[PDB]
Design a protein around this ligand. Structure first.
Ligand SMILES: C[C@@H]1O[C@@H](O)[C@@H](O)[C@H](O)[C@@H]1O
Ligand SMILES: C[C@@H]1O[C@@H](O)[C@@H](O)[C@H](O)[C@@H]1O
Ligand SMILES: C[C@@H]1O[C@@H](O)[C@@H](O)[C@H](O)[C@@H]1O
Ligand SMILES: C[C@@H]1O[C@@H](O)[C@@H](O)[C@H](O)[C@@H]1O
Ligand SMILES: [Ca+2]
Ligand SMILES: [Ca+2]
Ligand SMILES: [Ca+2]
Ligand SMILES: [Ca+2]
Ligand SMILES: [Ca+2]
Ligand SMILES: [Ca+2]
Ligand SMILES: [Ca+2]
Ligand SMILES: [Ca+2]
Lengths: 114, 114, 114, 114
């Protein structure tokens, strides 16, 4: 199944934050309506916050997360959780290697803000 | 129901990151085995990271998140999610007022690291 | 925080399934637009499916779960999870006593159907 | 990523319930310790329960769900959710065709029981 693609409310701010846990340098791309809106990168095995930003979901609300390590795409897992019918989290893990810890880059998207 | 309390595997590193979305100054306490292990405090209406730290779950694995604003405990909502039987997220939202957006302090706990 | 209340897309079929795990007889009421649309009752300590039914979310999409044991409301806990940006689960646990296993009546709502 | 595989606590009784939403007949196998422990089959486009059973997770706790339709394995999506640090759901959706509704067989695993 497709992973790392979420439908957000239209025209709404959301936070996106990325964490690294790998010997490889991660590159995280955040796409909004199929255009690159943010790119984060770093190298840490201790959960460094390699980027955080507030973005707007635009007219379609379509948000996609892509992760790659020196050009090769990582395998993604994802889900969305809603607490008390209001608070949303979209969660992404990714695997760049063979140990299947799926933490090599971790992306958290949260809304609403403010 | 009790919220904000999580059982982690013993002696496991985990990341904790807190965001703020409120006019009020948020104080986030992270307790490991009933003892304060980290405290974050900050104010933002734009999802600013008010703290991030790597902690160890200790011998009991009990982790608890408290949130208060000017000494008043916020109402909490929480859940844990596990992706591909390996990647864990413990998620907390909190409400300090009346609009019930439950984002006034948001806390994300993730493990494993490394 | 409020629990057991979910907003579904309007005029959408959904499944609702209740399980029991308690010495007390559980009564599960499912409200659609503030009106009782289904009710199930039974006693089991071995996860009996005390009822399963297909309902329609109506014009408002507002779905609420209520659980009581001998007229006393149980304490509820809930969340919603979305898989591959399509498949929705709304999950309810409830506690009728003091052991806080929150399985005394368990309710699963899933959509889409068909 | 691997989907439909879950590590339960050893020697624990859990419930498993399967629903169908497809023109195809679903066969759902539940494996404990890499052997088939239960098999459900049926056909419905209305979310019928095609089986429900209580099983033991055994010495290793490893549980796996597989779904076959028309002779071929369906693509799976899954996650695990824990509410109030005590109530566990392992959730599986599956796709036997081309419309990607991932509801063609839906499997819910819940524990603890009792
Ligand atoms: C240090 C190692 O770096 C890569 O091999 C990752 O895939 C591993 O999960 C681990 O983080
Ligand atoms: C600016 C406002 O500040 C407090 O009143 C919060 O409870 C609101 O959710 C909002 O963030
Ligand atoms: C058999 C017991 O019945 C009630 O006391 C429940 O609250 C308990 O959780 C347990 O199921
Ligand atoms: C009736 C249809 O039957 C199969 O084609 C399923 O894959 C579809 O999702 C739909 O349920
Ligand atoms: Ca890895
Ligand atoms: Ca790693
Ligand atoms: Ca608020
Ligand atoms: Ca707020
Ligand atoms: Ca109980
Ligand atoms: Ca019980
Ligand atoms: Ca299908
Ligand atoms: Ca279907």
């Amino acid at each position: 199944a497709t992973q790392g693609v979420f439908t957000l409310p239209a025209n709404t701010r959301f936070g996106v934050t990325a964490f690294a846990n790998s010997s490889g340098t991660q590159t995280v791309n955040v796409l909004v309506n199929n255009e690159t809106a943010a790119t984060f990168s770093g190298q840490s095995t201790n959960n460094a916050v390699i980027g955080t930003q507030v973005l707007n979901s635009g007219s379609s609300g379509k948000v996609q997360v892509q992760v790659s390590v020196n050009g090769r795409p990582s395998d993604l897992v994802s889900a969305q959780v809603i607490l008390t019918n209001e608070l949303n989290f979209a969660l992404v893990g990714s695997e760049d290697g063979t140990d299947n810890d799926y933490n090599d880059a971790v992306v958290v998207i949260n809304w609403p803000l403010g």
